[model samples]
Target: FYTAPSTESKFTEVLSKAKLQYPTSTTVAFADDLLDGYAASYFYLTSDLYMQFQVAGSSQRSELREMETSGDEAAWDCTGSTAHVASAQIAIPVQEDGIEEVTILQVHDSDVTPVLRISWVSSITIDGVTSEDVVLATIRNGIDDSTATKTVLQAHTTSRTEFNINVQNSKLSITVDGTTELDEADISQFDGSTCYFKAGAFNNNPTDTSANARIKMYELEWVDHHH
Candidate 1:
């Protein structure tokens, strides 16, 4: 079974590592929906406290709602000896367009693009073929998407996926469903940079028109060794 913690406890735990970012321009306060269960739009906290992110029909920008790694918590140096770890179980239940995709987790740096990204992506291989997958893409020293190296951690499934990333001493490692996918690989391109962890829904749709994405997050954890 996927790790399921009590709602109240998870709320406080997730908040310590990340901050919620939603459409502030909307009519009703997003916080009210957190209490009223998606009364209008954006985010909803399930009866069990699981966070549900919904972005629909040109209602807002595609950045959508996300739990960005907050500065209020401990920070890490990209090349430092401190071990930085981030883990979460996430699922994408609805993807209308075969091309629909959403970023689920990431290791963000001070640079223009994230150093690491874990996303749920869907695509049609042939006119009649399909691909639903979760990918871990890393962009080392470059800011372009073409420079990223991707690994398909899980494929051909929709079940809740678990993943974690650990970075220490200019090295990186990742595991999906508890199996090592990338063994302590080099990530020195990000050395000398500041880094942090981010999770939650970040819609990858080109435009926000009508198409929607639904994301669920559970069992989030963030830790780093401290003095």
Candidate 2:
């Protein structure tokens, strides 16, 4: 197994497990949705089994669903057509603007085949000021599989990924992950201040991009950088 650099040398010189207080509930509220900004934090470790969320608003919720351990179609439905994973939600305050920042850290088997697809799924209606919910980023691996290893593992590597959502033009710039451009809905122009966030995998079938990919359950964080 290949190990990524140790996180010990990173962050403050404090213990990685420093006790931090998180919100008791998922719902975060705002006095008004206009001319206002919000932030939420959720934490997960290699040892934890569930995800968390904190936000201020009604109808604000985030959830995570596990795909089949083997071969099955697993996907994060931004189109509201295919919904399977029925568990945890990463509830957060949606903004009039698209996501300003999205950060993800993934830990997986070194032997695991290169993933073909990964993305952010959203569903919404769009107008001139607001656009329909579009899948922000869709990435795919172009590497040939004929020359890959079969059984290797790795330490939790922090593969940092990011994206900038352009609410004005309905476009995105993705960095970090290998593949980009999965699905797109138009939820940008809408003045709506709420959305649901989730994640999934695709491990087996070539077309089953959402089916068998094993998401090793890492840490994901998003923030609205603009005040």
Candidate 3:
């Protein structure tokens, strides 16, 4: 019997529902592997419930996974909208370089760069120790500047982190591990622009192909309040 794996079904369903941007192996082709639903470990549904994405260090741009809810019907204005939420239980590597310079989520505009970016600090060293803290930055100027104003969310470097990012009425609020981390105001820079939610492993260091970032999503949800 040809029993298709549950991961295979779920993976295909997600692609039908959202847009996933990963390389078709710009470095090389995974022909036989591609015939299967696993996608050569670049992006696939793991454990039948979790989505796993990896971007190896060797080819930065060639192997990243970006899931975007971007389409004409998915786009909406930031103002006068209910709290549009995207929450997930994500797992990152315990290693330092795993996420030191990687973007995991974003609120982006097609015509412009991301208005909001959530990623990990390059080096979260505290008290002579390396702390893996998530940084929630807002590019109020409608830029995708990683160095923009940011707030830190206490998270575990050892793994599984929960994130609930909500934006509404020109404001931004984030909850990490079921607790509030940041709540900011005056983000009207992108009010007139249509935006969408995008989550993935976007590597920042294109030069360090030797260090890759592997991210696992235990639970992914997009509570769009566009109605």
Candidate 4:
């Protein structure tokens, strides 16, 4: 759910609060494959609606090269796991210090339906990622992995529903066609205030294979505007 800036100019005012600093300033991070324009070998963020940056030389780099996105260089595919999901994350360095609210966006692989999660970690640990840091938000209800999966049978399909949960993680409300789904849940009982995106259906069942279970992400925009 990130993007690649087509012009390579400046990240918008969002950067000021996006916190690029570690620990205190770090908010959220995502992978390129989970962002828009990834197929074209670029990164983009929804805040500006354009590619983040163009590779200096290479057109498209595999998942390996994507992990170097956080250091002074770049960590692209830095936080992915084959067990549940293939995801990467980075600490959004804000212009200031302290816990600043930030938004994250990404696009998931169309062949695998997974969930996006956030947590405080010293380093990216697949097996070590505790369940305490997840705050589930957008859930890609079902998968329809065709090239035109985005285009379902008119009203029969959903256009990716978005939900708003308080920073307290006390409750969540999903809106679709101006309607609400899942009134609310006691999220505080979960663990951390950190949030994430999830896919799949009840029982975490394999509703469909890559043909239908894959969750392709586009953009994740987080800011102080925690709706």
Highest TM-score against the true fold, candidate: 1
Model 3: weakest 10-residue lDDT segment is 25-34
Q: Please give the lDDT score at residue 28 for candidate 3.
A: 34
For model 1, the superposed segments whose C-alpha errors exceed 4 Å read: 1-7, 23-40, 57-74, 124-134, 140-146
Candidate 2, residue 157: how far the Cα is off, in Å: 12
Best by lDDT: 1
With a 3 Å backbone cut-off (N, CA, C), the pairs that clash in candidate 3 are 57-209, 58-209
In candidate 4, which residue ranges exceed 4 Å CA deviation?
A: 1-169, 192-220, 225-227
Tens digits of per-residue lDDT, candidate 4, 86-183, equal 22122222111221111232223223432222211112223344232222233233344222111010121123433322222344333333444335
Off by over 4 Å in 3: 1-15, 24-38, 57-73, 96-99, 124-140, 144-147
Q: List candidate 2 segments past 4 Å from native.
A: 1-171, 177-194, 200-213
Ordering by TM-score: 1, 3, 4, 2
> Would you give me the overall lDDT of model 2?
0.24
Clashes of 1: 2
Model 3 lDDT per residue over 133-165, tens place? 545454546554444555557654646788888
TM-score of each: 0.74, 0.24, 0.72, 0.29
Candidates' RMSD to native? 5.9, 19.2, 5.5, 16.9
> Model 1, 62-127: lDDT tens per residue?
222223344343346876898888877766675666336667777877655578877766652433
Ranking by lDDT: 1, 3, 4, 2
Error of 1 at 39 (Å): 9.0
